[PDB]
Scaffold this motif. Structure first.
Motif, PDB file in Angstrom:
ATOM      1  N   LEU A 268      -3.664  -0.284  -3.577  1.00 53.68           N
ATOM      2  CA  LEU A 268      -1.967  -0.508  -3.094  1.00 53.68           C
ATOM      3  C   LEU A 268      -1.531  -1.700  -3.317  1.00 53.68           C
ATOM      4  O   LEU A 268      -2.183  -2.596  -2.947  1.00 53.68           O
ATOM      5  CB  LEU A 268      -2.245   0.189  -1.670  1.00 53.68           C
ATOM      6  N   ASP A 269      -0.461  -1.715  -3.747  1.00 46.50           N
ATOM      7  CA  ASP A 269       0.446  -3.053  -3.968  1.00 46.50           C
ATOM      8  C   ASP A 269       0.845  -3.319  -2.470  1.00 46.50           C
ATOM      9  O   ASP A 269       0.834  -3.040  -1.462  1.00 46.50           O
ATOM     10  CB  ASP A 269       1.634  -2.899  -4.767  1.00 46.50           C
TER      11      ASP A 269
ATOM     12  N   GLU B   2       3.789  -1.559  -1.455  1.00 47.14           N
ATOM     13  CA  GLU B   2       3.388  -0.222  -1.118  1.00 47.14           C
ATOM     14  C   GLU B   2       2.286  -0.222  -0.006  1.00 47.14           C
ATOM     15  O   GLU B   2       2.347   0.558   0.968  1.00 47.14           O
ATOM     16  CB  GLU B   2       2.650   0.230  -2.162  1.00 47.14           C
TER      17      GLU B   2
ATOM     18  N   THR C 107       4.783  -0.214   3.384  1.00 45.52           N
ATOM     19  CA  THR C 107       5.330   0.979   3.417  1.00 45.52           C
ATOM     20  C   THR C 107       4.505   1.803   3.897  1.00 45.52           C
ATOM     21  O   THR C 107       4.382   2.703   4.977  1.00 45.52           O
ATOM     22  CB  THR C 107       5.870   1.662   2.033  1.00 45.52           C
TER      23      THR C 107
ATOM     24  N   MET D  23       4.720   9.003  -0.345  1.00 46.21           N
ATOM     25  CA  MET D  23       5.028   8.047  -1.004  1.00 46.21           C
ATOM     26  C   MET D  23       5.207   8.142  -2.589  1.00 46.21           C
ATOM     27  O   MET D  23       5.355   7.536  -3.424  1.00 46.21           O
ATOM     28  CB  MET D  23       4.035   6.816  -0.944  1.00 46.21           C
TER      29      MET D  23
ATOM     30  N   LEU E 253       2.669   8.929  -4.286  1.00 43.28           N
ATOM     31  CA  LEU E 253       1.434   8.550  -5.222  1.00 43.28           C
ATOM     32  C   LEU E 253       0.550  10.155  -5.238  1.00 43.28           C
ATOM     33  O   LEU E 253      -0.041  10.539  -4.161  1.00 43.28           O
ATOM     34  CB  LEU E 253       0.757   7.618  -4.458  1.00 43.28           C
TER      35      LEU E 253
ATOM     36  N   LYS F 198       2.146   3.900  -9.571  1.00 39.41           N
ATOM     37  CA  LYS F 198       2.390   2.799  -8.710  1.00 39.41           C
ATOM     38  C   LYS F 198       3.545   2.162  -9.325  1.00 39.41           C
ATOM     39  O   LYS F 198       4.352   1.503  -8.370  1.00 39.41           O
ATOM     40  CB  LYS F 198       1.177   1.992  -8.868  1.00 39.41           C
TER      41      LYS F 198
END
Lengths: 93, 976, 349
Positions: B15-16, B19, B22, B76, B78, C46
């Protein structure tokens, strides 16, 4: 000398420059368990090969990691975090 | 417990940063709605990925934590990571006479051959079965060179003869040494079986009765890979006679005697070469460097190992019992012969030399024994020494070109030009040794430096390693001189040491960035490590080395800009970094922390801006700021001595009181001439205080950015009043806000006055329409200060552009730059804009992207630019759907025009004829285009060589597909 | 490699110079980058962005015609397939061109070939099958030594396409006799069988409770496992070469062997053009995030296209016709195969 098997997917080029750090024997046994049956699954998910050895005195136990250096530091941090959680859990009880 | 958490952490480490934030917000909302189990909010906010996963398991529960995380992942948007998590959960969550004579003779033979010149438990299982269900026939062994493979094989066969190993599986053991098979040009399997027996005759029928009874132990497969380089047909029959290498190949491939089973002992390169033949094997791993280094130390230049090896070697080379004796000529000749032998060994990748090769070289055995005492390291050092003192093209070059084992040789080679290591050699030999290597090495590093792109991180790190090995100040100064800016990851302590040493001697350094992770020692609290001693836990050497690197960063004379592309800084780390920046001698202008993670130590950043005088810019981002921190920022800005001229806050999640404090400092602080707030939730209640601050006549602001603030009409009228009152501000950006026609109209009304002093305004994604364009055009007439405008990604149809063109057709307008992207344009707007270009006299730029301009539009713009009066500087075309005829027309126009300089064409479909036309037009002497946007590699070779030919004429021309090259810095630095 | 006048590395120069001395007689190519932080690509001024760059970074020599290719990203390997067997490569090292594979997978049986391959979405299994073969084999890649763990019986049938679905433990197959079977990896017993079309189905794709297939007859059909109802037929003009289903939304992308592409939505019968070419398409593949798709054809060109409308971003030329491609799960690497070689590209945006 110590003899070990290596999978067919882990390249041989990465075996250079390994990493090692020691821990308590009891903590290591709790973390991995007496059988250490989980090592293959952790390796497949982490693209990294592990190796647990017990010192002669039976007090300090070594762990090893192979792979790229960033992976090594990542796994070291994960293991130390888990070790701290287990240490505090024991301290409470 | 730990087993499932491990997989979960690995799920959350994809996860960034945004991200990750969030995810934390969604989790906090879920927890707050929950009353069964409560999770503190500060702990959530302070936790990292590993802590997050561990706590999520601890409070919720394994299965429930997995389910919650999967659900949030789905929220999200994802999908893939969700599927990975589900599968890894599925896999991690638990359910809820003759033979005796033969063997004796073999044991005597092997005892004799070993006389002339723990692991049992693992070896016993080498043929058993694993959990998957499998029984291997072929087993390959490899490892470091210290162990003797022949020793292992002979010990294993001896134990087999004793009967304690594989007693029930096979009864016949065969040992095949490759050297002996190579000695004889012709051989056969029956010949070998007969030879191994003492009587020279064996029952072929009995031997071949069953396959299980047999076994073959090859050894040293790597010795002759040169013979194996030849390719030959394999033999199905076993009674035939063929060269030994073909027999070995066919036996490894299992095309001959398939039922039998093998075993092989080999070196690393050997298992690199043989991995392609063996079928479904079971490789293994085996494991005198430490002993050699210990012996050298006991037999004593601590800075580098090349020095230690050179010292030990020169000690060995000194005549025994005599010190400071110049070598005789024959001694030097034999030394050169030995070194040439070693170099040939390195190049040919053979570590074994038979006496025949030694005789060919000619050096005596006694002299060789006297010269050496104890290894690959020694051979590499000897190759270096050779360099210090065959067919036209051979495969041994490329083979050694893998630079997998030649790294040590080069490391040593760079280490010998050090004077401290050179002088003992000169006195020992007593003769001058000129060397042309130094020129080549310097040219090599300098060739690295000259690369147009910023140096690759890995190349730069290895260059630092080698140069640090050199240990020569003037050498490094001459080498490093070439380049200006560097990019340098830091992965290990030795990396820090190399980076610290090798940068003090760079005279033209301006910019640098460091990606630091995993170096910072575990905190003394909650990370106690029994293995680490007391010194490692606190006041560790890494602390001193990081402090020294910080001091070097501070004390550089020509350093200006510092940046952190990514990092996980500890509070102690940021404290130490800031400590070395409060010193007045520092000269760094800019900073950057947008991508890093520095939240715990952000408070330390304000002291330096308060103290240092030469700091000019400061950029934050993505961090979290509390009210106390903003109060500290205000107080630090309030010091009369500060000269900071720019600030940038982002996504800090401020509070109303924070906006009030910021407004007060804006009205009070005279130095600050800019401010940016993008991603903050600044409602109209956050717009009004700022406007009130702006109203006063002392405000010294000149720029302002407000992105995703989500202001409304009330904010628009507040800003209108402030602007009519104010007389200082120049740049304003309100993008991604839902102002609408009413806000556009309010700002326009405020701007119609002749005393307004705005010069650049941009409104993107503002939900404008035809009416907003009409209002802006109406307020544009009767103004001469505003010079730039941009209305991108709004459904402004042809009619709005028509109104703007009607307003701009006048001689009184002073609009220079106008960009509009994704506006649903067509040919009619192109006719209007061609009129404007032909007539106007101040428009200097234009942009039309993602618009279906088509052939008619490009033809109209071409008819416009054909004129000699036009003063258009740069034009922007892309994704407009072009073709051949339009490209022909554009080529003609570019041939005619003389003021156009920049240009751009990508995401279009040109036919080869069209590309020919375009290159021919670019060829004309009249046109002078200093930039062109195209992809070379996207075309056939003919086109590539044509464009290269065009590039040869007018060496100033630049053909790079990625535009925004050579574009001024302000245009994109202002917007952000 | 070929495209440049000559490919060179940084240490190549020093090695060449030292060799020349011993015997007495951008510019520098880069290696792939794996870590996500080191990409350091600035925000456009992503992820769902559309790519804007390509560059070759290796060539793989197999020795014989190449029929199918697969790329794993969790592990770095790559798999090539030919009539005589399968070869496993690696991408970790740095070399201009490769000649020494990671392992060989041969088959010894008279008149026995292979024609297809397929990897599991978890990177743990590998279906193989071909003409005149006893059964369809599955290889266990997770184990420390390649070895078949199961067999799927089939007699007197030739398989021309494969597929799998790991959520429900279903493996699928298509045969030249117009027969589509099913299995179960727990028991390995045929569950159902769909037949009635001698022309057969060249390509099959599985998602949820539908099975879309197409063949020379120029029709697309949909079957549902739960019931035994008849399929829903759609009519097209040319033959169908390959299919792929978007993971995000409801679309089905196919090539018509006349340089046209069409999108079909399960909910309603809607179609629209998204590309036109003078060649014949031989494969189409969908990105892991459904924002763009790749298309490899017969007129020596590799193309990349944009999902929202179908406009083409760019394309790269080659020497020999291509017949396969495969986009990694990272969305970064894309492999292709032509002639007797298999090359590797990289995507940066």
């Amino acid at each position: 000398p110590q003899i070990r098997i290596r999978p067919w997917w882990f390249p041989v080029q990465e075996l250079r420059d390994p990493l090692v750090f020691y821990l308590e024997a009891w903590l290591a046994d709790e973390l991995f368990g007496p059988d250490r049956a989980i090592i293959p699954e952790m390796e497949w998910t982490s693209q990294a090969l592990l190796t647990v050895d017990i010192v002669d005195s039976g007090n300090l136990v070594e762990i090893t990691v192979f792979g790229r250096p960033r992976v090594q530091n990542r796994v070291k941090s994960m293991l130390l975090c888990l070790a701290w959680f287990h240490r505090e859990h024991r301290a409470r009880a | 417990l730990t087993f499932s958490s491990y997989g979960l952490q690995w799920c959350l480490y994809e996860l960034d940063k945004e991200e990750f934030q969030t995810f934390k917000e969604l989790l906090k909302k879920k927890s707050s709605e929950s009353t069964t189990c409560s999770i503190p909010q500060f702990e959530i906010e302070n936790a990292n990925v590993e802590c997050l996963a561990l706590l999520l398991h601890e409070y919720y529960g394994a299965s429930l934590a997995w389910a919650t995380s999967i659900s949030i992942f789905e929220n999200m948007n994802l999908r893939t990571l969700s599927e990975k998590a589900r599968d890894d959960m599925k896999r991690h969550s638990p359910e809820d006479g003759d033979t005796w004579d033969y063997k004796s003779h073999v044991m005597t033979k092997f005892a004799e051959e070993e006389d002339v010149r723990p692991e049992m438990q693992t070896l016993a299982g080498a043929f058993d079965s694993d959990r998957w269900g499998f029984r291997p026939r072929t087993v390959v062994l490899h490892g470091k060179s210290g162990i003797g493979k022949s020793a292992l094989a002979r010990r294993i066969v001896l134990c087999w003869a004793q009967g304690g190993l594989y007693q029930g599986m096979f009864s016949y053991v065969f040992f095949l040494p490759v050297r002996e098979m190579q000695r004889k040009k012709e051989s056969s399997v029956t010949e070998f079986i007969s030879r191994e027996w003492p009587d020279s005759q064996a029952p072929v029928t009995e031997i071949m009765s069953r396959p299980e009874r047999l076994l073959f132990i090859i050894d040293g497969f790597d010795d002759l890979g040169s013979v194996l380089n030849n390719d030959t047909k394999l033999c199905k029959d076993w009674a035939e006679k063929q060269p030994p290498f073909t027999l070995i190949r066919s036996l490894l491939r299992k095309v001959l005697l398939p039922e039998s089973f093998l075993i092989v002992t080999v070196r690393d390169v050997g298992t690199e070469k043989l991995k392609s033949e063996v079928v479904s094997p079971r490789y293994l791993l085996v494991r005198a460097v430490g002993s050699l280094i210990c012996v050298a130390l006991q037999l004593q230049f601590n800075q580098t190992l090349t020095g230690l090896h050179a010292a030990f070697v020169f000690h060995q080379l000194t005549p025994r019992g005599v010190v400071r004796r110049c070598l005789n000529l024959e001694e030097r000749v034999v030394l050169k012969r030995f070194c040439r032998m070693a170099v040939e060994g390195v190049w040919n990748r053979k570590s074994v030399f038979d006496g025949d090769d030694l005789m060919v070289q000619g050096l005596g055995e006694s002299e060789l024994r006297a010269l050496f005492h104890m290894h690959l390291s020694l051979q590499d050092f000897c190759a270096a020494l050779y360099y210090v003192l065959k067919t036209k093209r051979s495969m041994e070059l490329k083979q050694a070109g893998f630079h997998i084992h030649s790294l040590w040789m080069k490391r040593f080679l760079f280490g010998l030009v050090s004077e401290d290591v050179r002088r003992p050699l000169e006195v020992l030999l007593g003769c001058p040794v000129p060397l042309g290597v130094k020129q080549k090495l310097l040219h090599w590093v300098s060739l690295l430096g000259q690369q147009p792109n910023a140096t690759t991180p890995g190349d730069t790190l290895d260059a630092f390693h080698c140069l640090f090995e050199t240990q020569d100040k003037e050498f490094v100064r001459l080498a490093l001189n070439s380049f200006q800016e560097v990019w340098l990851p830091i992965n290990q302590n030795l990396d820090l040491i190399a980076s610290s040493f090798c940068l003090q001697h760079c005279p033209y350094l301006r910019k640098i960035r460091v990606d630091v992770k995993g170096i910072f020692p575990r905190d003394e609290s909650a990370e106690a490590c029994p293995v680490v001693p007391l010194w490692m836990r606190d006041k560790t050497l890494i602390e001193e080395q990081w402090e020294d690197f910080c001091s070097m960063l501070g004390t550089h004379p020509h350093l200006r800009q510092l940046d952190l592309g990514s990092s996980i800084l500890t509070e102690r780390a940021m404290k130490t970094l800031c400590a070395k920046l409060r010193h007045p001698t520092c000269k760094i202008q800019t900073l950057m922390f947008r991508n890093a993670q520095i939240t715990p130590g952000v408070q330390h950043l304000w002291r330096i801006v308060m103290a240092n005088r030469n700091l000019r810019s400061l950029n934050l981002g993505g961090t979290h700021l509390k009210e106390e921190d903003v109060r500290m920022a205000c107080e630090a800005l309030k010091h009369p001595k500060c000269l900071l001229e720019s600030l940038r806050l982002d996504c800090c999640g401020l509070t109303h009181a924070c906006y009030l404090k910021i407004s007060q400092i804006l009205t009070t602080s005279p130095s600050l001439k800019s401010l940016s707030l993008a991603g903050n939730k600044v409602t109209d209640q956050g717009v009004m205080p700022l406007s009130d601050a702006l109203r006063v006549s002392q405000c010294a602001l000149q720029k302002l950015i407000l992105e995703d603030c989500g202001i409304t009409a009330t904010g628009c009228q507040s800003l209108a009043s402030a602007l009519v009152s104010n007389r200082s501000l120049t740049h304003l950006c309100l993008s991604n806000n839902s102002l609408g026609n009413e806000g556009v109209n309010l700002l326009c009304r405020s701007m119609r006055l002749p005393h307004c002093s705005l010069q650049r305004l941009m409104l993107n994604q503002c939900h404008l329409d035809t009416a907003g364009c009409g209002f802006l055009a109406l307020a544009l007439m009767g103004n001469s200060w505003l010079t730039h405008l941009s209305l991108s990604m709004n459904p402004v149809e042809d009619n709005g552009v028509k109104l703007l063109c009607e307003v701009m057709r006048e001689p009184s307008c002073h609009l220079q730059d106008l960009e509009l992207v994704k506006c649903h344009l067509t040919a009619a707007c192109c006719e209007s804009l061609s009129c404007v270009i032909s007539r106007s006299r101040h428009l200097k730029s234009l942009d039309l992207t993602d618009n279906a301009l088509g052939d008619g539009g490009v033809a109209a713009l071409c008819e416009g630019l054909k004129q000699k009066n036009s003063v258009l500087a740069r034009l922007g075309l892309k994704a407009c759907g072009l073709t051949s005829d339009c490209c022909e027309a554009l080529s003609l126009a570019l041939s005619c025009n003389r003021h156009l300089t920049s240009l751009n064409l990508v995401q279009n479909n040109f036919s080869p004829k069209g590309m020919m036309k375009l290159c021919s037009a670019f060829a004309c002497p009249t046109s002078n285009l200093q930039i062109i946007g195209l992809w070379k590699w996207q075309y056939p070779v003919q086109i590539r060589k044509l464009l290269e030919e065009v590039q040869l004429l007018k060496p100033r021309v630049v053909i790079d597909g990625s535009w925004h090259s050579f574009d001024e810095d302000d245009r994109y630095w202002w917007k952000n | 490699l070929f495209w440049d006048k000559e490919p060179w590395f940084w240490h190549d120069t020093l090695t060449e110079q030292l060799w020349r001395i011993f015997a007495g007689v951008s510019r520098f190519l880069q290696s792939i980058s794996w870590d996500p932080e080191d990409f350091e690509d600035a925000w456009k001024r992503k992820r769902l962005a559309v790519p804007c760059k390509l560059e070759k970074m290796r060539i793989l020599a197999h020795g014989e015609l190449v029929l199918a290719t697969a790329i794993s990203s969790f592990t770095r390997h790559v798999f090539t397939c030919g009539r005589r067997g399968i070869k496993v490569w690696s991408l970790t090292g740095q070399v201009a061109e490769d000649r020494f594979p990671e392992s060989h997978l041969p088959i010894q049986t008279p008149g026995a070939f292979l024609r297809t391959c397929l990897l599991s979405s978890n990177s743990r299994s590998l279906l193989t099958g071909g003409y005149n073969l006893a059964s369809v084999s599955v290889w266990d890649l997770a184990a420390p030594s390649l070895h078949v763990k199961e067999q799927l019986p089939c007699a007197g049938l030739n398989c021309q396409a494969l597929d799998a679905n790991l959520d429900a433990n279903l493996a699928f197959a298509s045969f030249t006799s117009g027969v589509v079977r099913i299995w179960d990896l727990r028991d390995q017993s045929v569950v159902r069988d769909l037949k009635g079309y001698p022309d057969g189905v060249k390509s099959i794709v599985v998602k949820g409770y539908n099975i879309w297939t197409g063949g020379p007859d120029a029709c697309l059909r949909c079957w549902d496992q739960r019931t035994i109802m008849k399929p829903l037929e759609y009519q097209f003009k040319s033959q169908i070469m390959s299919l792929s289903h978007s993971p995000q939304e409801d679309w089905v992308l196919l090539g018509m062997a006349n340089g046209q592409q069409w999108l079909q939505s399960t909910s309603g019968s809607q179609r629209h053009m998204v590309g036109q070419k003078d060649s014949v398409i031989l494969s189409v593949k969908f990105s892991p995030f459904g924002q763009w798709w790749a298309s490899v054809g017969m007129d020596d060109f590799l193309g990349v296209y944009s999902m929202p409308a179908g406009t083409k971003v760019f394309e790269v030329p080659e020497m020999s016709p291509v017949t396969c491609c495969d986009v990694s799960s990272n969305n970064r690497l894309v492999v292709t195969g032509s002639g007797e070689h298999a090359s590797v590209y990289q995507i940066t945006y």
